[PDB]
Amino acid sequence: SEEEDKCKPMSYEEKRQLSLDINKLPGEKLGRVVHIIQSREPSLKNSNPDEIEIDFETLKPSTLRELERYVTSCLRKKRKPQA
């Protein structure tokens, strides 16, 4: 319950791999993450939804753990509906 929103930041390796794990999500699944960051990080909700600007060094620790937790749920499966 509180481990997600009151989490500590992940390392540079993990943040970078998180950029890579969202890159793995097919457009359908991907649209969630683009939305997640934009929803949690108001400062980048000005980014065009087609070309969203994510700054992994500014995202909240909970944002990272929402992004990672969500994508890993997808990667750890046969994620080939639109890919």
């Binding site: 943040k15 457009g27 939804p49 087609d50 994510i54």
Partner: peptide, 12 residues
């Protein structure tokens, strides 16, 4: 210095 330009949701 890490930026993720996720390019998607483009209208078709």
């Amino acid at each position: 210095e890490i930026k993720l330009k996720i390019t998607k949701t483009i209208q078709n």
